[PDB]
Structure 1
Amino acid sequence: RVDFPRSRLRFKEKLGEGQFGEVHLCEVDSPQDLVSHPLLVAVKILRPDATKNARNDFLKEVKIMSRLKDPNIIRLLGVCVQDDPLCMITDYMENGDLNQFLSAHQLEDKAAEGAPGDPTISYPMLLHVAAQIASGMRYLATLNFVHRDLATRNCLVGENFTIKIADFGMSRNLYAGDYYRVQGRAVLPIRWMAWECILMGKFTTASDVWAFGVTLWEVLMLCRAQPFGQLTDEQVIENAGEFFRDQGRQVYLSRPPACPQGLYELMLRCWSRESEQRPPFSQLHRFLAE
């Protein structure tokens, strides 16, 4: 297995920067360097002073991505692992992450004539978006692959509302509020987590389905609110306990203004107390893509 030629990566702009690296947008001329006119790629590079643990994390991140080959999953274009600055190369998704994208749009209304504010997105397009997410998750489930951090902040939008699922980890300061963190413990996206995940700390496909229910809720909110937004983290964790008790005191996310009751009731099924009663992704995908 040979390296992608880093000299073929022409820098365009720093796209982002993190604790152990930077992310660059680069152009690749004549991209017959890959088995799968300039190509736009995103590049993740480990900062030179990267500690030994960070480097190991990088190499493992790269191994994990090599598995993923699906239209609605992010794909690893190539890597630079043999020499000093370590790189991961992937497709540039020109419309950024799904959370920021939806935050910039308003809901379409064909019964009205109004002054042009933000760009619109129709209810059918929101479903097209959700369906693709379900298709990606469906593929991961056939790999018995567990995501563990599904949310709009981890989806990417390309041309023509094509969506891919990804995982940026949990260190980007923009979304630091979507994660609960206690010294000595693992970092947790509790507002997206199923109750048994919060209490017992183990993740499964059944729990991915829960998080998908929350991500769908985000999409239909046009990402205007954080889930359980008026609740503190302690309260959100307590609520998981209330699911465990099962005495009718657990609370759910409310129906979004856009959202038809039927679509909502689908979100409810994703939040069943019992794992095995939550719909499979295949069944989700079939509902949304109809």
Structure 2
Amino acid sequence: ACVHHIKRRDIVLKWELGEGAFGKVFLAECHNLLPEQDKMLVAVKALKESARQDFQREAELLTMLQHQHIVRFFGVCTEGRPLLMVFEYMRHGDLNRFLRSHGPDAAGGEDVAPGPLGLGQLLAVASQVAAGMVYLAGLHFVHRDLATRNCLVGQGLVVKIGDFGMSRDIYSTDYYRVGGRTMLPIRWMPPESILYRKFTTESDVWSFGVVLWEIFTYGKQPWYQLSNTEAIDCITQGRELERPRACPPEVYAIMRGCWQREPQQRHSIKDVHARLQALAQAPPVYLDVL
């Protein structure tokens, strides 16, 4: 348990940002956290209710996972309930909201032009999320719920991967509630995950595949035209998501790389990150003709 601790007195809650059923999130000022900044803004998750153990496991895990494109964890405040986890504040919030609000069905601020994000803007986002997934597959860590609702966008369109309990509330429609405890992101899962309940690196590249589709559809729900049971039938019957208008055939091919029926046929995430980075850093003259 080599988790950083922060004194309660160094955390000033400002207001709420989000509610789940296991946690509340707050904007807070945090003091003496960085020398660069004597004071600075963070998001703080307060535990609602076993629960303490889950909190200790979450904190140990998030102290392990550090990387440019994983949500930055600063540490815990264990001095009095509510127990707090302290996170970097991501000014644009979740990538799904960010996509929807820069999509044809939505103006231009500080980090972004008005109107649809450009192809180069969408490859940059896809690249960063892939960079994140490399680092997790690196550690042989299976995510199990990769989707735009579980990434955050910071100042400068820095995109980072998380896994938020509040996602099951805010975005319940993205989950199939089985039995009455469990919640399955069926629209993001490959056939082996739905059929055999196996979760692997390779079930995560499938999910990354669908993230790529979300990016290029500006955050539409995959199979939005289908019920949860229709999506299951269609995913088990091998039916593949259509190329979005904004998706060049060359990007659609990376998606197909992630959707090979056979887990082992799927391109590695390293390969995909490489394909996507290369495009995002390609000169406009090359991209304007893709």
Structure 1 residue aligned with 2:133: 137
CA distance in 2, matches of 1:21, 1:134: 28
Instruction: Count how many residue pairs are aligned between Structure 1 and Structure 2.
Output: 267
CA change 1:184–1:102 in 2 (3 A) is: closer
TM-score w.r.t. length of structure 1: 0.86
CA distance in 2, matches of 1:80, 1:62: 11
CA RMSD of aligned residues (A): 2.0
Structure 2 residue aligned with 1:24: 26
CA change 1:154–1:258 in 2 (3 A) is: same
Amino acid at match of 1:13: W
Given that 1:106 and 1:118 are in contact with CA atoms closer than 8 Å, whether structure 2 keeps it comes out as no
What are the ranges of 5 or more consecutive residues in structure 1 without an aligned counterpart?
108-116, 243-249
CA change 1:106–1:20 in 2 (3 A) is: closer
Amino acid at match of 2:39: P
Query: Which of 249, 252, 271 is matched with 1:264 structurally?
Result: 252
1:263: how far off?
0.8
2:16 is the counterpart of 1:14: yes
Alignment of 1:66-77 (within 5 A): 66-77=63-74
CA distance in 1, matches of 2:27, 2:17: 6
What are the ranges of 5 or more consecutive residues in structure 2 without an aligned counterpart?
105-112, 279-290
CA distance in 2, matches of 1:171, 1:161: 21
TM-score w.r.t. length of structure 2: 0.86
Alignment of 1:1-290 (within 5 A): 3-32=5-34, 38-47=39-48, 50=49, 53-106=50-103, 119-169=115-165, 172-183=168-179, 186-223=182-219, 225-242=220-237, 250-290=238-278
% identity of equivalent residues:
47
CA distance in 2, matches of 1:62, 1:31: 17
CA distance in 2, matches of 1:98, 1:6: 30
CA distance in 1, matches of 2:144, 2:72: 18
Given that 1:19 and 1:171 are in contact with CA atoms closer than 8 Å, whether structure 2 keeps it comes out as no
1:145: how far off?
0.6
CA change 1:11–1:169 in 2 (3 A) is: closer
CA distance in 1, matches of 2:167, 2:69: 23
1:30: how far off?
3.6
Q: Which 4+ residue blocks in structure 1 deviate beyond 6 angstroms? A: none
1:185: how far off?
6.1
